[PDB]
Design a protein around this ligand. Structure first.
Ligand SMILES: [Mg+2]
Ligand SMILES: [Mg+2]
Ligand SMILES: [Zn+2]
Ligand SMILES: [Zn+2]
Ligand SMILES: [Zn+2]
Ligand SMILES: [Zn+2]
Lengths: 449, 449
């Protein structure tokens, strides 16, 4: 009557003020850990990435949304945890670059090779290396690529595209920045063109804008990328209703969902942190974003439809799910935007876990590309950076600080960070590992090669 | 019987520029993990604490001393890992206070009750709670308390004292700061007097200064703390020569080593970080402190002796080792000092792991009280705080940034952080747990009733 348990409840068990009340455990965990260890092969894999979602980000989001002694039913629920490194390389020297971007990190987990900041699917010598999606596909597995960002963004693009710079979104930018990759130059194509060739079964996100560009060469020269996708038999959907109307997605009729021109709308609204924000302004309470929609699918919905479609495959499936805007809102120094996308991702993880639990042969991994700027500090802190006071679920104030940049955007940080997993082969995330180890873990799990 | 392994080598496997070159794993971990899970009783527990050592501090030290792709033979070797929370409580409201001090967090793990910032061994109503060392002693176990800080400091003090404020070092301050704890007003005494009453087998650290104080009352009034110590039978030692000469350590001959007036000397020196210091000044290489001596025992030496004296006890032991100055040097915004003390701890952890691996019935836990300010950022970073560039073991540049305060000292942060363990009951550290579970976990392991 086996089955691998998920963490059902790790909230504070009683009165936070009393002896034993703040305890998240209720008894010895040994037995439960043992039950969590299997080396059986995995049929499927669900990789959920919170971009910029390091330990700090998780904590701030839990404190705010669930209270300090709360528990994220999705994020905190994975039983096997570790900490991994995500350094990148200096292109010229080949030595470590301690603070990676999304492009180099995404490449790392999806290819198993370290690269330079800005590179997608290539190494420091600019050699193309096959990705876990292409490999899964090659072996006959269904494949999914879902994200809240523009599909040309680095995170999802890493799986289907090989370009020297993350910026070559479409023909236009490619010609000018990735001369080596430009179609009209003998190259493989811009990110959007490779994504279309890649042909995963299910791809959903934003970035409808770039599809308005036309190809400078080949069979579809002069037609728009959107027209191209139609001409090659993709099913195009652009709202919740039409998405939910899809019945099957495969190699004959691959799904392509374009839910916004750029990035998909953020779940919550609030003002930006500000200088001495926590002393000069009252505490903030985030509010749902009215532009979020009933016509716009949530991450959990996209995730849910994808598992549905992909699960038809007898052989199994690979699916990557990105909660994109945790990072984008961290850059913007917007606590509410940031937290709100963490809560969003947790909902997506709950869905993956519900599936995995009942299916029994699925590995579900939750992690991030790199760490980010936000820090939880004392309410009376006086910082030279940006700050904001928030009213949390506990009814107490929490102060959030962004102090690693004097200009435009807050930056990434190089701290090692959480990786949690559940299912067959989950054990490979425990202890210290490298981002590149995840590639090999997934490969091995899926039994590829 | 397949008795439990420590991670052997989690360094990058080969050439980090090549496929699979940065991998830390040489194969599937499932079997090894199974071998690591044991719910047999623990005979001994060694708890190592890096004050302010969040994942961030560990990463920087790693990059620095061992390279991005290196491995800490001590710190990174514990196979069972998780993340834990350490929020404190608001004294008046009892709602969470997101950022803890060393007093409140130390109280959490040593008594299993949350408390307010500044409290030592009391709850928000100011009532006492038995500490883990007190419970071990009651059971007839040998007990040790080692710090590189002054013994009065919060981390080591939380084990032996119950005062309303951490400032109540000795006679003088207590009278004025913790009236209800003052001896003259019938309290249990200042921290130092309370430490004396506690009578741990082995106590080593700095903090001699306060031992120069004269008691205001009791059977040793007018006499100094040091004189009282001698009168009570403690064996004093104030240098390394005399420490090694010690052969016995028990209840009627407790060891008390006072190796400094205040805190023991830090291993490494370097300039403090400065405004735009990564842009404005050359990269730094840390210098070994020439004033650290062959006369002053290192943490690993302190730990080594402690383990030896204590192990003579047939009943088992409880030992707490603190690498104190990580925190203090973080506050000071001194990368070299911060990193040097993490390297120091790592050395003490190795000593602990060595013993444990051989003995087979010892739980070893490595963690921190709370997170801190330091972040690793990109080399070209223009930040509003204090920054510095360092020359790592890789021959590359790493920049650390301090930007959560404009005031005197960098501040603590409330991010959840790594806890890692080896041995019997180590499984209770995996996943999400609270700083309060630690108490309960060590108490159940030793089967303290
Ligand atoms: Mg991203
Ligand atoms: Mg301390
Ligand atoms: Zn990112
Ligand atoms: Zn980013
Ligand atoms: Zn501390
Ligand atoms: Zn501190």
């Amino acid at each position: 009557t086996p089955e691998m348990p998920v963490l059902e409840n790790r909230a504070a068990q009683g009165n936070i003020t009393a002896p034993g009340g703040a305890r998240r455990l209720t008894g010895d965990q040994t037995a439960a850990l043992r039950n969590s260890l299997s080396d059986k092969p995995a049929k499927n894999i669900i990789l959920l990435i919170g971009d910029g979602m390091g330990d700090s980000e998780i904590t701030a989001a839990r404190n705010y949304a669930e209270g300090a002694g709360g528990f994220f039913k999705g994020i905190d629920a994975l039983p096997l945890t570790g900490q991994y490194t995500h350094y990148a390389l200096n292109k010229k020297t080949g030595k470590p670059d301690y603070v990676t971007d999304s492009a180099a990190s995404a490449t790392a987990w999806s290819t198993g090779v370290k690269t330079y900041n800005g590179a997608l699917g290539v190494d420091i010598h600019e050699k193309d290396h096959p990705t876990i999606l292409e490999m899964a596909k090659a072996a006959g597995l269904a494949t999914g690529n879902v994200s809240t960002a523009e599909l040309q963004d680095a995170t999802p693009a890493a799986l289907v595209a090989h370009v020297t710079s993350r910026k070559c979104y479409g023909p236009s930018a490619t010609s000018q920045k990735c001369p080596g990759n430009a179609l009209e130059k003998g190259g493989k194509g811009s990110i959007t063109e490779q994504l279309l060739n890649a042909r995963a079964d299910v791809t959903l996100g934003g970035g409808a804008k770039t599809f308005a560009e036309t190809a400078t060469a080949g069979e579809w020269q002069g037609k728009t990328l959107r027209e191209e996708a139609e001409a090659r038999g993709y099913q195009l959907v652009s709202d919740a209703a039409s998405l939910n109307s899809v019945t099957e997605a495969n190699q004959q009729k691959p799904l392509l969902g374009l839910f916004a021109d750029g990035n998909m709308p953020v779940r919550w609204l609030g003002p930006k942190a500000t200088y001495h924000g926590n002393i000069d302004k009252p505490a903030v309470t985030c509010t749902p974003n009215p532009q979020r929609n009933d016509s716009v699918p949530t991450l959990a919905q996209m995730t849910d439809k994808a598992i549905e479609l992909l699960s038809k495959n007898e052989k199994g499936f690979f699916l990557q799910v990105e909660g994109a805007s945790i990072d984008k809102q961290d850059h913007a120094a917007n606590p509410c935007g940031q937290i709100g996308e963490t809560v969003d991702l947790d909902e997506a993880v709950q869905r993956a876990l519900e599936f995995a639990k009942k299916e029994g042969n699925t590995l579900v991994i939750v992690t991030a590309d790199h760490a980010h700027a936000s820090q939880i500090v004392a309410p009376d802190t006086k910082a030279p950076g940006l700050t904001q006071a928030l009213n949390t679920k506990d009814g107490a104030v929490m102060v959030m600080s962004y102090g690693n940049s004097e200009e435009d955007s807050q930056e990434h940080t190089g701290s090692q960070l959480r990786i949690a997993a559940y299912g067959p082969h989950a054990a490979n995330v425990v202890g210290l590992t490298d981002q590149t180890d995840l590639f090999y873990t997934m490969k091995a799990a899926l039994g590829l090669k």
